[PDB]
mmCIF file of C-alpha atoms and ligand atoms in Angstrom:
data_model
loop_
_atom_site.group_PDB
_atom_site.id
_atom_site.type_symbol
_atom_site.label_atom_id
_atom_site.label_comp_id
_atom_site.label_asym_id
_atom_site.label_seq_id
_atom_site.Cartn_x
_atom_site.Cartn_y
_atom_site.Cartn_z
ATOM 1 C CA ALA A 95 -26.574 26.522 -9.782
ATOM 2 C CA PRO A 96 -25.955 28.534 -12.962
ATOM 3 C CA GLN A 97 -26.259 26.411 -16.090
ATOM 4 C CA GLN A 98 -22.664 27.185 -17.081
ATOM 5 C CA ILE A 99 -21.399 25.669 -13.816
ATOM 6 C CA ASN A 100 -23.667 22.610 -14.014
ATOM 7 C CA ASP A 101 -22.606 22.004 -17.622
ATOM 8 C CA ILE A 102 -18.834 22.202 -17.145
ATOM 9 C CA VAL A 103 -19.004 20.169 -13.926
ATOM 10 C CA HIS A 104 -20.923 17.345 -15.607
ATOM 11 C CA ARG A 105 -18.731 17.304 -18.725
ATOM 12 C CA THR A 106 -15.530 17.331 -16.636
ATOM 13 C CA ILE A 107 -16.183 15.362 -13.440
ATOM 14 C CA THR A 108 -18.548 12.621 -14.625
ATOM 15 C CA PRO A 109 -16.005 11.480 -17.280
ATOM 16 C CA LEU A 110 -13.202 11.798 -14.724
ATOM 17 C CA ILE A 111 -15.178 9.411 -12.500
ATOM 18 C CA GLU A 112 -15.787 7.093 -15.462
ATOM 19 C CA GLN A 113 -12.103 7.202 -16.418
ATOM 20 C CA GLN A 114 -10.655 6.714 -12.921
ATOM 21 C CA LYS A 115 -13.288 4.310 -11.512
ATOM 22 C CA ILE A 116 -14.006 6.606 -8.543
ATOM 23 C CA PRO A 117 -16.696 5.135 -6.237
ATOM 24 C CA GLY A 118 -17.762 8.408 -4.608
ATOM 25 C CA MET A 119 -16.963 12.055 -5.082
ATOM 26 C CA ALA A 120 -17.844 15.487 -3.752
ATOM 27 C CA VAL A 121 -17.030 18.748 -5.538
ATOM 28 C CA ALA A 122 -17.585 22.358 -4.531
ATOM 29 C CA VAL A 123 -17.170 25.084 -7.144
ATOM 30 C CA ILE A 124 -16.759 28.538 -5.619
ATOM 31 C CA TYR A 125 -17.927 31.083 -8.203
ATOM 32 C CA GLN A 126 -18.100 34.803 -7.394
ATOM 33 C CA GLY A 127 -17.478 33.779 -3.790
ATOM 34 C CA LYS A 128 -20.428 31.373 -3.523
ATOM 35 C CA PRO A 129 -20.117 27.582 -3.295
ATOM 36 C CA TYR A 130 -22.084 25.233 -5.518
ATOM 37 C CA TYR A 131 -22.139 21.583 -4.479
ATOM 38 C CA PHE A 132 -22.096 18.343 -6.469
ATOM 39 C CA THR A 133 -21.930 14.712 -5.363
ATOM 40 C CA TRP A 134 -21.649 11.323 -7.050
ATOM 41 C CA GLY A 135 -21.698 7.726 -5.937
ATOM 42 C CA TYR A 136 -21.238 6.097 -2.565
ATOM 43 C CA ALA A 137 -19.431 6.819 0.675
ATOM 44 C CA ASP A 138 -19.865 3.150 1.618
ATOM 45 C CA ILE A 139 -20.315 0.826 -1.361
ATOM 46 C CA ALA A 140 -21.560 -2.240 0.507
ATOM 47 C CA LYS A 141 -24.083 -0.269 2.590
ATOM 48 C CA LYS A 142 -25.163 1.733 -0.494
ATOM 49 C CA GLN A 143 -24.724 4.940 1.510
ATOM 50 C CA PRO A 144 -24.564 7.864 -0.947
ATOM 51 C CA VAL A 145 -22.036 10.661 -0.816
ATOM 52 C CA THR A 146 -23.707 13.757 0.640
ATOM 53 C CA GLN A 147 -22.611 17.235 1.690
ATOM 54 C CA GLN A 148 -22.208 15.737 5.191
ATOM 55 C CA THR A 149 -19.836 12.960 4.089
ATOM 56 C CA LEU A 150 -16.391 13.070 5.710
ATOM 57 C CA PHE A 151 -13.392 12.456 3.423
ATOM 58 C CA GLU A 152 -9.721 12.016 4.302
ATOM 59 C CA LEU A 153 -7.958 15.178 3.133
ATOM 60 C CA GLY A 154 -4.485 13.657 3.241
ATOM 61 C CA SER A 155 -1.807 16.257 2.583
ATOM 62 C CA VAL A 156 -4.375 19.025 2.111
ATOM 63 C CA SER A 157 -4.123 18.910 5.927
ATOM 64 C CA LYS A 158 -0.874 20.872 5.550
ATOM 65 C CA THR A 159 -2.803 24.014 4.567
ATOM 66 C CA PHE A 160 -4.412 23.997 8.024
ATOM 67 C CA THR A 161 -0.984 23.463 9.589
ATOM 68 C CA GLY A 162 0.469 26.351 7.593
ATOM 69 C CA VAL A 163 -2.320 28.730 8.583
ATOM 70 C CA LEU A 164 -2.095 27.706 12.249
ATOM 71 C CA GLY A 165 1.625 28.435 12.066
ATOM 72 C CA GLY A 166 0.918 31.800 10.471
ATOM 73 C CA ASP A 167 -1.567 32.550 13.251
ATOM 74 C CA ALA A 168 1.186 31.813 15.780
ATOM 75 C CA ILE A 169 3.498 34.201 13.913
ATOM 76 C CA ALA A 170 0.830 36.915 14.025
ATOM 77 C CA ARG A 171 0.445 36.308 17.767
ATOM 78 C CA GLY A 172 4.189 36.866 18.157
ATOM 79 C CA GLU A 173 4.535 33.375 19.640
ATOM 80 C CA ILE A 174 7.058 32.188 17.027
ATOM 81 C CA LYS A 175 9.291 33.625 14.321
ATOM 82 C CA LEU A 176 10.169 31.695 11.180
ATOM 83 C CA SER A 177 13.822 32.666 11.697
ATOM 84 C CA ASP A 178 13.809 30.947 15.099
ATOM 85 C CA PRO A 179 16.102 27.909 15.416
ATOM 86 C CA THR A 180 14.406 24.545 15.778
ATOM 87 C CA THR A 181 16.382 23.976 18.984
ATOM 88 C CA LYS A 182 14.637 26.929 20.652
ATOM 89 C CA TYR A 183 11.492 24.769 20.831
ATOM 90 C CA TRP A 184 13.162 21.334 21.183
ATOM 91 C CA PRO A 185 16.344 21.861 23.222
ATOM 92 C CA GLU A 186 16.871 18.084 23.369
ATOM 93 C CA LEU A 187 17.759 18.101 19.638
ATOM 94 C CA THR A 188 21.434 18.513 20.474
ATOM 95 C CA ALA A 189 22.867 16.909 17.322
ATOM 96 C CA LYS A 190 25.067 19.379 15.469
ATOM 97 C CA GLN A 191 23.321 19.017 12.097
ATOM 98 C CA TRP A 192 20.394 20.966 13.588
ATOM 99 C CA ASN A 193 22.491 24.123 13.975
ATOM 100 C CA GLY A 194 21.152 26.557 11.390
ATOM 101 C CA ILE A 195 17.847 24.748 10.756
ATOM 102 C CA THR A 196 14.989 27.182 11.388
ATOM 103 C CA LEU A 197 11.226 26.897 11.625
ATOM 104 C CA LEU A 198 11.109 28.349 8.101
ATOM 105 C CA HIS A 199 13.163 25.412 6.809
ATOM 106 C CA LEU A 200 10.883 22.894 8.516
ATOM 107 C CA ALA A 201 7.718 24.569 7.237
ATOM 108 C CA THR A 202 8.912 24.770 3.615
ATOM 109 C CA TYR A 203 10.745 21.416 3.247
ATOM 110 C CA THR A 204 14.149 23.143 2.937
ATOM 111 C CA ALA A 205 15.935 21.777 6.034
ATOM 112 C CA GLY A 206 18.251 19.665 3.871
ATOM 113 C CA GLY A 207 16.527 16.407 3.047
ATOM 114 C CA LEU A 208 14.260 15.395 5.909
ATOM 115 C CA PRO A 209 12.540 12.265 4.548
ATOM 116 C CA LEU A 210 9.101 12.060 2.974
ATOM 117 C CA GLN A 211 7.677 9.956 5.817
ATOM 118 C CA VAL A 212 8.431 9.615 9.488
ATOM 119 C CA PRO A 213 9.417 5.921 9.763
ATOM 120 C CA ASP A 214 6.552 3.608 10.677
ATOM 121 C CA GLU A 215 8.664 2.239 13.548
ATOM 122 C CA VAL A 216 8.453 5.607 15.359
ATOM 123 C CA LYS A 217 5.774 4.945 17.995
ATOM 124 C CA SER A 218 7.001 6.907 21.049
ATOM 125 C CA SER A 219 8.352 10.357 21.844
ATOM 126 C CA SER A 220 11.687 8.659 22.549
ATOM 127 C CA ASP A 221 11.594 7.095 19.077
ATOM 128 C CA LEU A 222 10.792 10.466 17.516
ATOM 129 C CA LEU A 223 13.764 12.132 19.213
ATOM 130 C CA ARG A 224 16.160 9.385 18.116
ATOM 131 C CA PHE A 225 14.829 9.686 14.555
ATOM 132 C CA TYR A 226 15.550 13.409 14.258
ATOM 133 C CA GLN A 227 18.766 13.179 16.291
ATOM 134 C CA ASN A 228 20.220 10.561 13.920
ATOM 135 C CA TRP A 229 18.937 12.039 10.655
ATOM 136 C CA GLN A 230 21.841 13.181 8.477
ATOM 137 C CA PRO A 231 21.107 15.969 5.962
ATOM 138 C CA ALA A 232 22.042 15.524 2.316
ATOM 139 C CA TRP A 233 22.239 19.288 1.691
ATOM 140 C CA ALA A 234 22.833 22.496 3.587
ATOM 141 C CA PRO A 235 19.663 24.168 4.895
ATOM 142 C CA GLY A 236 17.866 26.578 2.602
ATOM 143 C CA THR A 237 19.171 25.210 -0.699
ATOM 144 C CA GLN A 238 16.976 22.267 -1.763
ATOM 145 C CA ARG A 239 13.243 21.625 -1.441
ATOM 146 C CA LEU A 240 12.306 17.992 -0.751
ATOM 147 C CA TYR A 241 8.617 17.574 0.093
ATOM 148 C CA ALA A 242 8.491 15.867 3.482
ATOM 149 C CA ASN A 243 5.863 15.033 6.083
ATOM 150 C CA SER A 244 8.675 14.785 8.644
ATOM 151 C CA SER A 245 9.531 18.437 7.902
ATOM 152 C CA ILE A 246 6.260 20.352 8.079
ATOM 153 C CA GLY A 247 5.005 17.796 10.591
ATOM 154 C CA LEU A 248 7.698 18.860 13.037
ATOM 155 C CA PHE A 249 7.008 22.518 12.227
ATOM 156 C CA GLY A 250 3.379 22.076 13.273
ATOM 157 C CA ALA A 251 4.229 20.288 16.516
ATOM 158 C CA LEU A 252 6.757 22.955 17.516
ATOM 159 C CA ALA A 253 4.741 25.982 16.361
ATOM 160 C CA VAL A 254 2.081 25.307 19.015
ATOM 161 C CA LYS A 255 4.480 24.879 21.951
ATOM 162 C CA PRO A 256 4.410 28.549 23.099
ATOM 163 C CA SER A 257 0.619 28.325 23.391
ATOM 164 C CA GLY A 258 0.789 25.435 25.857
ATOM 165 C CA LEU A 259 -1.905 23.714 23.782
ATOM 166 C CA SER A 260 -1.652 20.400 21.990
ATOM 167 C CA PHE A 261 -1.600 20.604 18.202
ATOM 168 C CA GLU A 262 -5.194 19.343 18.039
ATOM 169 C CA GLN A 263 -6.400 21.719 20.762
ATOM 170 C CA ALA A 264 -4.635 24.627 19.069
ATOM 171 C CA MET A 265 -6.146 23.780 15.679
ATOM 172 C CA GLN A 266 -9.679 23.424 17.083
ATOM 173 C CA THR A 267 -9.687 26.630 19.124
ATOM 174 C CA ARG A 268 -7.655 28.843 16.771
ATOM 175 C CA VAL A 269 -8.663 27.708 13.262
ATOM 176 C CA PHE A 270 -11.620 25.315 13.113
ATOM 177 C CA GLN A 271 -13.940 27.003 15.627
ATOM 178 C CA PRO A 272 -13.451 30.658 14.530
ATOM 179 C CA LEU A 273 -14.101 29.626 10.908
ATOM 180 C CA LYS A 274 -17.124 27.509 11.919
ATOM 181 C CA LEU A 275 -15.567 24.350 10.474
ATOM 182 C CA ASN A 276 -17.740 22.288 12.802
ATOM 183 C CA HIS A 277 -17.464 19.035 10.814
ATOM 184 C CA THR A 278 -13.685 19.035 10.367
ATOM 185 C CA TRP A 279 -11.748 16.654 12.593
ATOM 186 C CA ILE A 280 -8.257 15.465 13.366
ATOM 187 C CA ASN A 281 -9.947 12.618 15.267
ATOM 188 C CA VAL A 282 -13.485 11.761 14.141
ATOM 189 C CA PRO A 283 -15.694 11.555 17.260
ATOM 190 C CA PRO A 284 -17.775 8.379 17.650
ATOM 191 C CA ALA A 285 -21.026 10.273 17.046
ATOM 192 C CA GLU A 286 -19.706 11.443 13.649
ATOM 193 C CA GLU A 287 -18.277 8.094 12.476
ATOM 194 C CA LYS A 288 -21.577 7.473 10.667
ATOM 195 C CA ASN A 289 -20.619 10.216 8.173
ATOM 196 C CA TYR A 290 -17.071 8.914 7.595
ATOM 197 C CA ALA A 291 -16.700 7.608 4.053
ATOM 198 C CA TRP A 292 -14.673 4.495 3.380
ATOM 199 C CA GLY A 293 -11.677 4.791 1.127
ATOM 200 C CA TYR A 294 -11.214 2.129 -1.523
ATOM 201 C CA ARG A 295 -7.847 0.668 -2.536
ATOM 202 C CA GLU A 296 -7.819 -2.274 -4.955
ATOM 203 C CA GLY A 297 -11.461 -2.834 -4.025
ATOM 204 C CA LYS A 298 -10.909 -2.970 -0.246
ATOM 205 C CA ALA A 299 -12.416 -0.483 2.212
ATOM 206 C CA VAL A 300 -9.704 1.360 4.146
ATOM 207 C CA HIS A 301 -9.080 4.287 6.480
ATOM 208 C CA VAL A 302 -5.781 6.064 7.064
ATOM 209 C CA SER A 303 -3.639 4.456 9.717
ATOM 210 C CA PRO A 304 -2.296 6.388 12.725
ATOM 211 C CA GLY A 305 1.274 7.619 12.549
ATOM 212 C CA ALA A 306 3.684 10.053 14.134
ATOM 213 C CA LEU A 307 2.814 13.674 13.284
ATOM 214 C CA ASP A 308 -0.114 12.503 11.155
ATOM 215 C CA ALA A 309 -2.423 15.310 12.311
ATOM 216 C CA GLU A 310 0.106 17.881 11.087
ATOM 217 C CA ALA A 311 0.865 16.301 7.705
ATOM 218 C CA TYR A 312 -2.056 14.216 6.443
ATOM 219 C CA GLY A 313 -4.630 13.387 9.124
ATOM 220 C CA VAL A 314 -7.543 15.830 8.815
ATOM 221 C CA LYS A 315 -11.002 14.720 7.666
ATOM 222 C CA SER A 316 -13.682 17.128 6.484
ATOM 223 C CA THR A 317 -16.888 17.553 4.518
ATOM 224 C CA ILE A 318 -17.308 19.253 1.162
ATOM 225 C CA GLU A 319 -19.255 22.028 2.904
ATOM 226 C CA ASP A 320 -16.502 22.744 5.440
ATOM 227 C CA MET A 321 -13.824 22.613 2.736
ATOM 228 C CA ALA A 322 -15.756 25.118 0.633
ATOM 229 C CA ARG A 323 -15.814 27.390 3.689
ATOM 230 C CA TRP A 324 -12.072 26.816 4.099
ATOM 231 C CA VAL A 325 -11.551 27.936 0.502
ATOM 232 C CA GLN A 326 -13.773 30.978 1.067
ATOM 233 C CA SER A 327 -11.661 31.874 4.103
ATOM 234 C CA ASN A 328 -8.444 31.700 2.072
ATOM 235 C CA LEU A 329 -10.014 33.660 -0.808
ATOM 236 C CA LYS A 330 -11.269 36.469 1.455
ATOM 237 C CA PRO A 331 -9.102 36.697 4.586
ATOM 238 C CA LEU A 332 -10.337 40.216 5.346
ATOM 239 C CA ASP A 333 -13.749 38.695 6.096
ATOM 240 C CA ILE A 334 -12.147 36.894 9.063
ATOM 241 C CA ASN A 335 -12.728 38.993 12.175
ATOM 242 C CA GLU A 336 -9.977 37.377 14.280
ATOM 243 C CA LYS A 337 -6.977 39.468 13.256
ATOM 244 C CA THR A 338 -4.313 36.847 14.020
ATOM 245 C CA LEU A 339 -6.151 34.268 11.881
ATOM 246 C CA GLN A 340 -6.736 36.755 9.058
ATOM 247 C CA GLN A 341 -3.009 37.475 9.100
ATOM 248 C CA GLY A 342 -2.153 33.791 9.468
ATOM 249 C CA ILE A 343 -4.096 33.006 6.305
ATOM 250 C CA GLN A 344 -2.241 35.797 4.510
ATOM 251 C CA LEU A 345 1.160 34.597 5.730
ATOM 252 C CA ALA A 346 0.497 31.038 4.537
ATOM 253 C CA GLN A 347 0.139 32.460 0.999
ATOM 254 C CA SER A 348 3.327 34.525 1.213
ATOM 255 C CA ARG A 349 6.006 33.342 -1.220
ATOM 256 C CA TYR A 350 9.083 32.076 0.642
ATOM 257 C CA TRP A 351 10.915 30.089 -2.055
ATOM 258 C CA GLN A 352 10.770 29.802 -5.840
ATOM 259 C CA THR A 353 11.582 26.810 -8.033
ATOM 260 C CA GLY A 354 10.601 26.995 -11.675
ATOM 261 C CA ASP A 355 7.254 28.773 -11.862
ATOM 262 C CA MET A 356 6.188 27.440 -8.438
ATOM 263 C CA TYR A 357 6.314 29.283 -5.106
ATOM 264 C CA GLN A 358 6.318 27.655 -1.667
ATOM 265 C CA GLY A 359 3.998 29.022 1.002
ATOM 266 C CA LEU A 360 3.134 27.580 4.403
ATOM 267 C CA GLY A 361 1.306 24.437 3.313
ATOM 268 C CA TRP A 362 -0.137 26.159 0.254
ATOM 269 C CA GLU A 363 1.794 26.314 -3.018
ATOM 270 C CA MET A 364 1.264 29.152 -5.490
ATOM 271 C CA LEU A 365 1.886 30.112 -9.108
ATOM 272 C CA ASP A 366 1.228 33.375 -10.929
ATOM 273 C CA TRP A 367 -2.179 33.598 -12.597
ATOM 274 C CA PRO A 368 -2.729 33.105 -15.532
ATOM 275 C CA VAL A 369 -0.957 29.784 -15.099
ATOM 276 C CA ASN A 370 0.487 27.447 -17.709
ATOM 277 C CA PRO A 371 -1.854 24.464 -17.202
ATOM 278 C CA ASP A 372 0.795 21.944 -18.243
ATOM 279 C CA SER A 373 3.060 23.209 -15.445
ATOM 280 C CA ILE A 374 0.578 22.515 -12.649
ATOM 281 C CA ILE A 375 -0.623 19.275 -14.265
ATOM 282 C CA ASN A 376 2.831 17.847 -14.950
ATOM 283 C CA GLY A 377 4.266 19.259 -11.733
ATOM 284 C CA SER A 378 1.642 17.429 -9.660
ATOM 285 C CA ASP A 379 2.960 14.015 -10.717
ATOM 286 C CA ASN A 380 4.655 12.318 -7.765
ATOM 287 C CA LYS A 381 7.813 11.844 -9.846
ATOM 288 C CA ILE A 382 8.220 15.646 -9.902
ATOM 289 C CA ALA A 383 6.367 16.901 -6.827
ATOM 290 C CA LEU A 384 8.452 14.641 -4.566
ATOM 291 C CA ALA A 385 11.824 15.200 -6.253
ATOM 292 C CA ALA A 386 14.584 17.243 -4.652
ATOM 293 C CA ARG A 387 14.785 20.586 -6.446
ATOM 294 C CA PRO A 388 16.962 23.685 -5.923
ATOM 295 C CA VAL A 389 15.180 26.727 -4.507
ATOM 296 C CA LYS A 390 15.825 30.471 -4.564
ATOM 297 C CA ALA A 391 15.004 32.365 -1.383
ATOM 298 C CA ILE A 392 12.560 35.273 -1.554
ATOM 299 C CA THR A 393 13.664 37.784 1.092
ATOM 300 C CA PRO A 394 11.491 39.355 2.315
ATOM 301 C CA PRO A 395 8.763 36.852 1.394
ATOM 302 C CA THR A 396 6.349 38.224 -1.181
ATOM 303 C CA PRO A 397 3.062 39.164 0.540
ATOM 304 C CA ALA A 398 0.154 37.083 -0.749
ATOM 305 C CA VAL A 399 -0.369 37.855 -4.436
ATOM 306 C CA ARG A 400 -4.038 38.059 -5.390
ATOM 307 C CA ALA A 401 -3.332 37.041 -9.012
ATOM 308 C CA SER A 402 -2.226 33.549 -8.011
ATOM 309 C CA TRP A 403 -3.248 29.949 -8.562
ATOM 310 C CA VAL A 404 -3.131 28.625 -4.974
ATOM 311 C CA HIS A 405 -3.447 24.887 -4.520
ATOM 312 C CA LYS A 406 -2.634 21.674 -2.685
ATOM 313 C CA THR A 407 -2.964 17.965 -3.496
ATOM 314 C CA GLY A 408 -3.585 15.210 -0.975
ATOM 315 C CA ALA A 409 -3.798 11.440 -0.848
ATOM 316 C CA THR A 410 -4.193 8.548 1.556
ATOM 317 C CA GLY A 411 -4.357 4.861 0.728
ATOM 318 C CA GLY A 412 -8.016 5.169 -0.176
ATOM 319 C CA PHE A 413 -8.646 8.865 -0.865
ATOM 320 C CA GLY A 414 -7.642 11.585 -3.309
ATOM 321 C CA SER A 415 -8.137 15.309 -2.730
ATOM 322 C CA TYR A 416 -7.389 18.584 -4.469
ATOM 323 C CA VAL A 417 -8.035 22.235 -3.635
ATOM 324 C CA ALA A 418 -7.301 25.189 -5.919
ATOM 325 C CA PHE A 419 -8.353 28.832 -5.848
ATOM 326 C CA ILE A 420 -7.626 32.196 -7.477
ATOM 327 C CA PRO A 421 -8.122 35.112 -5.032
ATOM 328 C CA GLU A 422 -8.312 37.854 -7.671
ATOM 329 C CA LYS A 423 -11.194 36.012 -9.377
ATOM 330 C CA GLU A 424 -12.947 34.826 -6.168
ATOM 331 C CA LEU A 425 -12.928 31.437 -7.852
ATOM 332 C CA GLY A 426 -12.083 28.018 -6.433
ATOM 333 C CA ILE A 427 -12.728 24.301 -6.397
ATOM 334 C CA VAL A 428 -12.600 21.422 -3.920
ATOM 335 C CA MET A 429 -12.463 17.830 -5.216
ATOM 336 C CA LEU A 430 -12.832 15.011 -2.660
ATOM 337 C CA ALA A 431 -12.851 11.349 -3.720
ATOM 338 C CA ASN A 432 -12.703 8.031 -1.866
ATOM 339 C CA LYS A 433 -10.221 6.478 -4.270
ATOM 340 C CA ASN A 434 -6.559 7.478 -4.608
ATOM 341 C CA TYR A 435 -6.141 8.371 -8.295
ATOM 342 C CA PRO A 436 -3.242 10.213 -9.925
ATOM 343 C CA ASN A 437 -2.746 13.899 -9.157
ATOM 344 C CA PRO A 438 -2.424 15.029 -12.815
ATOM 345 C CA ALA A 439 -5.962 13.857 -13.554
ATOM 346 C CA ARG A 440 -7.285 15.919 -10.614
ATOM 347 C CA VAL A 441 -5.388 19.071 -11.578
ATOM 348 C CA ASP A 442 -6.381 18.814 -15.240
ATOM 349 C CA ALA A 443 -10.057 18.561 -14.284
ATOM 350 C CA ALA A 444 -9.794 21.465 -11.841
ATOM 351 C CA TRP A 445 -8.146 23.669 -14.443
ATOM 352 C CA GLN A 446 -10.749 22.793 -17.098
ATOM 353 C CA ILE A 447 -13.498 23.930 -14.719
ATOM 354 C CA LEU A 448 -11.916 27.135 -13.401
ATOM 355 C CA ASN A 449 -10.624 28.125 -16.852
ATOM 356 C CA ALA A 450 -14.175 27.809 -18.194
ATOM 357 C CA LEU A 451 -15.566 30.045 -15.433
ATOM 358 C CA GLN A 452 -12.958 32.833 -15.369
HETATM 359 C C1 LIG B 276 -0.135 13.924 1.249
HETATM 360 O O1 LIG B 276 -1.237 13.597 0.955
HETATM 361 N N1 LIG B 276 0.943 13.012 1.023
HETATM 362 C C2 LIG B 276 2.362 13.458 0.793
HETATM 363 C C3 LIG B 276 3.009 12.811 -0.431
HETATM 364 N N2 LIG B 276 2.382 13.344 -1.676
HETATM 365 O O2 LIG B 276 2.277 14.741 -1.629
HETATM 366 S S1 LIG B 276 0.999 15.186 -2.575
HETATM 367 O O3 LIG B 276 0.886 16.688 -2.654
HETATM 368 O O4 LIG B 276 1.237 14.818 -4.021
HETATM 369 O O5 LIG B 276 -0.281 14.590 -2.043
HETATM 370 C C4 LIG B 276 2.836 11.345 -0.434
HETATM 371 C C5 LIG B 276 1.412 10.983 -0.439
HETATM 372 C C6 LIG B 276 0.678 11.555 0.776
HETATM 373 C C7 LIG B 276 1.106 10.782 1.990
HETATM 374 O O6 LIG B 276 2.108 11.065 2.556
HETATM 375 N N3 LIG B 276 0.275 9.686 2.432
HETATM 376 C C8 LIG B 276 0.648 8.894 3.584
HETATM 377 C C9 LIG B 276 1.190 7.607 3.064
HETATM 378 C C10 LIG B 276 1.474 6.604 4.175
HETATM 379 N N4 LIG B 276 0.323 6.421 5.097
HETATM 380 C C11 LIG B 276 -0.273 7.696 5.577
HETATM 381 C C12 LIG B 276 -0.528 8.714 4.469
HETATM 382 CL CL1 LIG B 277 -22.016 15.191 -21.834
HETATM 383 ZN ZN1 LIG B 278 -22.408 13.583 -20.369
HETATM 384 ZN ZN1 LIG B 279 -23.360 17.933 13.036
#
């Protein structure tokens, strides 16, 4: 790799690892459209298995960017419209509070206060229906953004219904396979388990536990090589030959809502570039990112702006992830770690690197 990339990566990530006590880490820096790979530490401490470019990490909420693009692909196929009512795809949701709640609201966390998690007691389809049927909104739809797995999670499950495919089958055939993300999994096959890093929480080795709508909201696992290719695909959608996927990527970076200097896409979040680094750093803290915040609708949604900072954070019990890219600069970064450490430290490090390479 160019010396300037090697230098800034060492001076930024090695101290981050020292500071946060991260056992293993993989980073890809995309510079002029080309990925450069870096690894540190161990995927499995006790086995002394090093992190490699083949190591699988839990992406956590970065999974939502796949969900958003799959939803955009469905829009481009004409299978769904974001203005469609939720009840069009789940007629059994007869409770009156669902009148006026659209796929757009589900996808962008603006349905009116759907909770951060689907309750852990939801283990059956019957349970899931009762959960949504009895949920009572705190606000009218389209007025407040409250980040919620139960919101975009339901969007993903309903967006694939017109295809007749399961969410996992839809994602594999329509997103993963066309983009040659051949080591990206909702469910890690047995033959690939050997590459699956352990997460570490308070010293204990852990993997994410199954839950309702997990695939849609936080359940994808991937390698640093596949995630670099994912970033390349979102930097350069015109290189994607499948027109519905090309357009789906573009639609996920459209700007549907604004709050402060932040714009809500489908999974992705965006800010204008050049960005105020303190905004993205401070705004990534859970105290802010998870707070209910008023939103202003953008009608029609702004088509993907090339001069944007596009990004997403993710976490599981034992992992911490971050992806950020700037289409106009063909510049991006993927940071995968097998410890959950605070978002602001990830974002700060990412901005130090990309700012140095602009
Ligand atoms: C996604 O990784 N999430 C959503 C939320 N934080 O959003 S983020 O952008 O700052 O990452 C909470 C943390 C995380 C999440 O929901 N993790 C689940 C916790 C419960 N067990 C399964 C994973
Ligand atoms: Cl140094
Ligand atoms: Zn040093
Ligand atoms: Zn393989």
